[PDB]
Amino acid sequence: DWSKPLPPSERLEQELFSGGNTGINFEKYDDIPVEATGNNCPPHIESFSDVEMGEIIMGNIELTRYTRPTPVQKHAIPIIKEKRDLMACAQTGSGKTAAFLLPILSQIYSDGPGEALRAMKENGRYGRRKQYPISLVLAPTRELAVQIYEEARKFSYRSRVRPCVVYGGADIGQQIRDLERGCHLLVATPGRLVDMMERGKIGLDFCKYLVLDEADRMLVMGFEPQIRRIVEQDTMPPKGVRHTMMFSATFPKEIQMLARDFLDEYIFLAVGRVGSTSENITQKVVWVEESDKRSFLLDLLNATGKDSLTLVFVETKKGADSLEDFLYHEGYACTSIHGDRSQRDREEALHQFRSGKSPILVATAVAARGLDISNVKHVINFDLPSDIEEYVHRIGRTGRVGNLGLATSFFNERNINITKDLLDLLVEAKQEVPSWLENMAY
Numbered sequence: 001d002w003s004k005p006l007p008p009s010e011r012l013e014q015e016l017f018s019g020g021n022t023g024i025n026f027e028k029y030d031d032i033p034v035e036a037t038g039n040n041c042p043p044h045i046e047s048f049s050d051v052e053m054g055e056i057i058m059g060n061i062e063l064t065r066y067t068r069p070t071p072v073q074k075h076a077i078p079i080i081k082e083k084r085d086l087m088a089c090a091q092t093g094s095g096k097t098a099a100f101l102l103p104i105l106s107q108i109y110s111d112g113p114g115e116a117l118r119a120m121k122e123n124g125r126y127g128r129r130k131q132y133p134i135s136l137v138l139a140p141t142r143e144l145a146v147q148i149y150e151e152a153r154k155f156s157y158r159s160r161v162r163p164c165v166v167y168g169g170a171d172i173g174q175q176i177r178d179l180e181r182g183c184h185l186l187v188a189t190p191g192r193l194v195d196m197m198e199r200g201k202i203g204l205d206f207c208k209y210l211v212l213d214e215a216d217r218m219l220v221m222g223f224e225p226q227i228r229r230i231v232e233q234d235t236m237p238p239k240g241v242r243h244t245m246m247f248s249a250t251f252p253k254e255i256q257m258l259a260r261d262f263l264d265e266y267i268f269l270a271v272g273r274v275g276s277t278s279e280n281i282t283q284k285v286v287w288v289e290e291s292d293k294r295s296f297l298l299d300l301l302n303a304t305g306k307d308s309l310t311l312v313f314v315e316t317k318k319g320a321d322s323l324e325d326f327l328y329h330e331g332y333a334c335t336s337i338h339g340d341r342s343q344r345d346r347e348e349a350l351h352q353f354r355s356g357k358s359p360i361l362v363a364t365a366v367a368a369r370g371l372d373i374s375n376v377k378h379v380i381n382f383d384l385p386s387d388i389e390e391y392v393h394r395i396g397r398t399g400r401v402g403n404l405g406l407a408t409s410f411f412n413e414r415n416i417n418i419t420k421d422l423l424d425l426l427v428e429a430k431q432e433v434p435s436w437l438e439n440m441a442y
């Protein structure tokens with residue numbers, strides 16, 4: 001039924017596999033180790049043939065030119081196939097996307113869509129009420145959300161499963177109409193999925209496969225609330241019933257606590273460094289009285305040069321303004337993220353920060369919550385937050401895979417509380433620790 005592939009189509013098969021020509025770095029990954037922790041963990045696999053992937057998957061794997069499974073894909077696939085929860089850490093290019101889509105799809109085709117859906121299509125309840133995805137993949141940004149989606153279209157070619165993606169900063173009405181056309185594997189970004197839900201367009205009652213792609217990156221952009229609203233606060237099946245998978249390069253305490261509540265008797269999969277923060281990111285904490293702050297920032301900027309971008313965080317919108325004011329006044333090409341405005345207009349203001357025009361960007365925690373501010377070499381904490389949690393996804397905005405970024409933070413009496421946590425964080429990340437910091441912790 002859901003296992004026996006439907007008749008092909010050239011026009012469609014052409015659209016989905018436009019040559020591709022893109023293959024993963026298949027030689028500099030086999031050099032990286034893959035540790036798998038957990039009880040009675042299902043033994044990894046060598047070839048996609050080491051487990052019944054079903055007709056359709058095996059078929060589509062060919063049309064996408066995949067010979068054998070990447071490293072992570074060697075341990076991930078059999079883990080998901082034997083229906084075990086998973087927390088996986090691996091750097092981009094590892095082949096994470098295919099690692100969760102394949103086994104998941106292979107399962108739907110195998111097990112079918114569930115009796116709820118089955119006995120709901122054959123029920124004269126025709127129309128466009130509410131769609132219930134069988135699998136949900138939460139993603140941090142529209143860029144990645146769509147890549148995943150594209151990937152799903154390929155692997156779900158010639159099956160009863162219609163993939164569908166939604167995200168913010170687009171006409172919701174259009175996306176809503178797209179949902180109405182079919183949902184089985186919905187890929188979405190936290191905020192939008194919640195919006196769709198409130199609008200009664202999506203239901204999570206029959207979601208059996210939950211995947212949080214780049215959980216750490218999602219939290220950075222301040223999504224935790226929705227993620228929990230989505231998972232814990234709704235019609236979604238509890239753990240043990242639904243199968244969950246988390247994917248994230250870094251493994252901070254806020255992700256450990258997330259993997260804790262969401263995953264169930266899960267296997268930890270790490271293919272490299274167990275980073276508490278991004279491996280490639282430098283942290284310099286310096287003591288600066290409030291008065292000396294602006295001048296200190298200025299010296300910091302003159303040095304900046306580098307034809308790089310600088311993201312400057314402050315604590316209040318009030319000061320984000322007076323500082324943005326101060327910086328324009330001193331003759332600096334800087335802009336400011338508007339909190340109030342929609343994230344559609346906000347993703348616009350960044351279009352000019354990006355092209356050099358204004359290498360300086362001053363924003364508060366809130367104001368950027370939701371935005372994908374990438375391409376930033378220097379993140380400076382003009383003010384520090386109350387929690388070391390915030391600190392983490394604040395310095396997160398920099399050091400994106402490939403090149404190293406810098407995160408300078410001004411620290412003074414005003415935040416002696418977050419002392420001990422900041423110290424530990426630096427010890428862990430093996431950063432330089434100011435003697436005065438150690439002293440002010442007892």
Ligand SMILES: Nc1ncnc2c1ncn2[C@@H]1O[C@H](COP(=O)(O)OP(=O)(O)O)[C@@H](O)[C@H]1O
Binds near residue numbers: 073
């Ligand atoms: N097992 C594989 N064999 C050959 N190519 C693969 C395999 N897995 C992924 N790829 C290729 O790598 C690309 C995906 O890389 P990707 O999975 O998106 O890295 P990441 O998981 O960090 O985002 C795809 O376009 C695909 O063609």
